[PDB]
Design an enzyme around this catalytic site. Structure first.
Site, mmCIF file in Angstrom:
data_model
loop_
_atom_site.group_PDB
_atom_site.id
_atom_site.type_symbol
_atom_site.label_atom_id
_atom_site.label_comp_id
_atom_site.label_asym_id
_atom_site.label_seq_id
_atom_site.Cartn_x
_atom_site.Cartn_y
_atom_site.Cartn_z
ATOM 1 N N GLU A 1 0.828 -1.202 0.000
ATOM 2 C CA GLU A 1 0.000 0.000 0.000
ATOM 3 C C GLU A 1 0.863 1.252 0.000
ATOM 4 O O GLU A 1 0.551 2.182 -0.753
ATOM 5 C CB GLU A 1 -0.946 -0.030 1.213
ATOM 6 C CG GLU A 1 -2.051 -1.073 1.145
ATOM 7 C CD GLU A 1 -3.165 -0.785 0.126
ATOM 8 O OE1 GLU A 1 -3.254 0.304 -0.371
ATOM 9 O OE2 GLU A 1 -3.899 -1.773 -0.179
ATOM 10 N N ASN B 1 -7.587 8.986 -5.711
ATOM 11 C CA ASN B 1 -8.415 8.024 -6.393
ATOM 12 C C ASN B 1 -9.379 8.710 -7.373
ATOM 13 O O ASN B 1 -9.692 9.916 -7.249
ATOM 14 C CB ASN B 1 -9.240 7.257 -5.375
ATOM 15 C CG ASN B 1 -8.369 6.261 -4.648
ATOM 16 O OD1 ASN B 1 -8.838 5.531 -3.770
ATOM 17 N ND2 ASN B 1 -7.094 6.229 -5.072
ATOM 18 N N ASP C 1 -12.755 8.703 -7.643
ATOM 19 C CA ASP C 1 -13.960 9.266 -7.081
ATOM 20 C C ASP C 1 -13.766 10.592 -6.381
ATOM 21 O O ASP C 1 -14.740 11.083 -5.675
ATOM 22 C CB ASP C 1 -14.613 8.209 -6.226
ATOM 23 C CG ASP C 1 -13.875 7.839 -4.960
ATOM 24 O OD1 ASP C 1 -12.752 8.406 -4.742
ATOM 25 O OD2 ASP C 1 -14.491 7.090 -4.139
ATOM 26 N N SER D 1 -11.657 10.945 -3.828
ATOM 27 C CA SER D 1 -11.040 10.654 -2.545
ATOM 28 C C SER D 1 -9.524 10.512 -2.718
ATOM 29 O O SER D 1 -8.991 10.449 -3.813
ATOM 30 C CB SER D 1 -11.653 9.425 -1.951
ATOM 31 O OG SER D 1 -11.251 8.246 -2.662
ATOM 32 N N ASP E 1 -6.153 8.337 -0.591
ATOM 33 C CA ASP E 1 -5.689 7.392 0.401
ATOM 34 C C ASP E 1 -4.472 7.956 1.129
ATOM 35 O O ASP E 1 -3.562 8.515 0.512
ATOM 36 C CB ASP E 1 -5.300 6.089 -0.283
ATOM 37 C CG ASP E 1 -6.435 5.299 -0.876
ATOM 38 O OD1 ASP E 1 -7.545 5.437 -0.428
ATOM 39 O OD2 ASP E 1 -6.150 4.543 -1.850
ATOM 40 N N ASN F 1 -8.747 5.660 3.254
ATOM 41 C CA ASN F 1 -9.444 6.486 2.301
ATOM 42 C C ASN F 1 -10.313 7.592 2.912
ATOM 43 O O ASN F 1 -11.000 7.392 3.929
ATOM 44 C CB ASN F 1 -10.343 5.533 1.447
ATOM 45 C CG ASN F 1 -10.943 6.264 0.277
ATOM 46 O OD1 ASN F 1 -10.223 6.440 -0.720
ATOM 47 N ND2 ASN F 1 -12.183 6.590 0.300
#
Length: 129
Positions: free
Chosen positions: A35, A46, A48, A50, A52, A59
């Site tokens: 990650e 991301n 959408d 958002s 991380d 998120n």
């Protein structure tokens, strides 16, 4: 903070992640490796809208507040920047809520695609824990 492998293993273990919701320490170390590359400061946007955050790439649509994410729920009740700290406490506390939410570690797509089903104990080999 870029953690060493055994350094992170020891910290995760102290914070109660080894075997949390049945996921061994090696699963958590493997997740963090893929990650974030063990880097607490990692951030990635991301589609959408958002983002991380941190060593477990938590998120901003569900879990932490970053002030710019549509639909944000802040279920961990935390600013996302707190998930970038050299102290992993906040990330661990929030990860415990995430992994308890219904779909286990499958929330972590790098875990899912790179760790799940593999020899994850290899991630703690050589560590004194």
């Amino acid at each position: 903070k870029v953690f060493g492998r055994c350094e992170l293993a020891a910290a995760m273990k102290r914070h109660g992640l080894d075997n949390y919701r049945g996921y061994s320490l090696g699963n958590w170390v493997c997740a963090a490796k893929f990650e974030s590359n063990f880097n607490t400061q990692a951030t990635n946007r991301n589609t959408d809208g958002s983002t991380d955050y941190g060593i477990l790439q938590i998120n901003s649509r569900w879990w932490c507040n970053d002030g710019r994410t549509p639909g944000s729920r802040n279920l961990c009740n935390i600013p996302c920047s707190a998930l970038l700290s050299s102290d992993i406490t906040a990330s661990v506390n929030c990860a415990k809520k995430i992994v308890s939410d219904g779909n286990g570690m499958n929330a972590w797509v790098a875990w899912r695609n790179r760790c799940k089903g593999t020899d994850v104990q290899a991630w703690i080999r050589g560590c004194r824990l």
